Amino acid sequence: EMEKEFEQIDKSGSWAAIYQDIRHEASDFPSRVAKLPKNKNRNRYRDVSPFDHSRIKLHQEDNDYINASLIKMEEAQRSYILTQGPLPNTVGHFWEMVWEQKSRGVVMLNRVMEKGSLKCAQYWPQKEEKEMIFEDTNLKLTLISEDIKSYYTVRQLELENLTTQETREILHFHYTTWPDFGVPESPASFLNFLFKVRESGSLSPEHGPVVVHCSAGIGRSGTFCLADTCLLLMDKRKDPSSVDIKKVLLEMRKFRMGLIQTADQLRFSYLAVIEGAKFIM
Numbered sequence: 001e002m003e004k005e006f007e008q009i010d011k012s013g014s015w016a017a018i019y020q021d022i023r024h025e026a027s028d029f030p031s032r033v034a035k036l037p038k039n040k041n042r043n044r045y046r047d048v049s050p051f052d053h054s055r056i057k058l059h060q061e062d063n064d065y066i067n068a069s070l071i072k073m074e075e076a077q078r079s080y081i082l083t084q085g086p087l088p089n090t091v092g093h094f095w096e097m098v099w100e101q102k103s104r105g106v107v108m109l110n111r112v113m114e115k116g117s118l119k120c121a122q123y124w125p126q127k128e129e130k131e132m133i134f135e136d137t138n139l140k141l142t143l144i145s146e147d148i149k150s151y152y153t154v155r156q157l158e159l160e161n162l163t164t165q166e167t168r169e170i171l172h173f174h175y176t177t178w179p180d181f182g183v184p185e186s187p188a189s190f191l192n193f194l195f196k197v198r199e200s201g202s203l204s205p206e207h208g209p210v211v212v213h214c215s216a217g218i219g220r221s222g223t224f225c226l227a228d229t230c231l232l233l234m235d236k237r238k239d240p241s242s243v244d245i246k247k248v249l250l251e252m253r254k255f256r257m258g259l260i261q262t263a264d265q266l267r268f269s270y271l272a273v274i275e276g277a278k279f280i281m
């Protein structure tokens with residue numbers, strides 16, 4: 001059981017050690033499309049690339065590339081699109097991807113500015129009456145409503161395909177309180193946030209995959225998907241304690257590199273799953 005494995009790693013201070021074995025065992029697949037010179041300005045970080053096999057393709061004939069990966073968790077019956085925070089030049093591609101994949105929710109785990117630098121373009125409208133038009137992808141985005149709470153904001157948005165005049169409602173879940181350095185002290189508000197996303201229906205098989213991002217789409221974004229998938233597997237299985245976090249993380253890492261960036265994020269993921277298991281047993 002992970003709770004006892006947790007106390008062992010904690011009492012022995014072996015988190016950096018566990019973390020390094022995960023780094024060592026992690027899959028390495030080609031990412032040739034990401035490295036083409038015509039895609040250099042579509043990547044926020046030169047060392048964070050989607051694998052070719054799992055990359056999301058845009059349905060535009062010119063250049064189909066976006067820094068985004070499909071993570072397919074077969075046993076849990078959950079999919080997630082993990083992507084980078086959009087760049088000034090990729091905001092239109094981001095919303096095209098949301099449209100094309102039939103996503104119902106966007107999960108944002110960063111602030112636009114952290115540590116005095118911009119981690120993400122402002123890719124949604126700040127006021128009802130000031131909508132955004134993405135001329136490159138022929139989409140219009142309107143803020144419908146915004147509910148600001150202490151640890152997160154939920155926004156209703158309307159996305160309109162200007163080409164076909166179809167509209168969809170998108171939910172934007174913005175976790176606003178992740179600290180600039182380290183991880184939250186308690187996983188309580190993160191779990192509350194994850195249960196709010198689940199309650200919305202955004203993670204349900206009726207819809208396309210949820211879009212999850214932070215700045216790189218690997219660290220906080222990884223913690224989100226890893227906690228959700230582990231808790232779902234504990235509900236589904238005859239024996240809940242057969243769930244090995246390290247194995248689930250490695251299975252996820254076949255689909256996108258570098259998920260869980262620090263030993264701190266790994267420790268936090270264990271804590272979130274252990275605590276969430278109480279609210280699920």
Ligand SMILES: CO[C@H]1CC[C@@H]2C[C@H]1[C@@H](OC)CN2S(C)(=O)=O
Pocket residue numbers: 009012013014015016017263264267
């Ligand atoms: C990064 O913050 C935490 C993460 C977990 C702990 C303590 C500390 C790390 O020290 C930088 C080392 N690990 S540890 C002892 O398990 O190797």
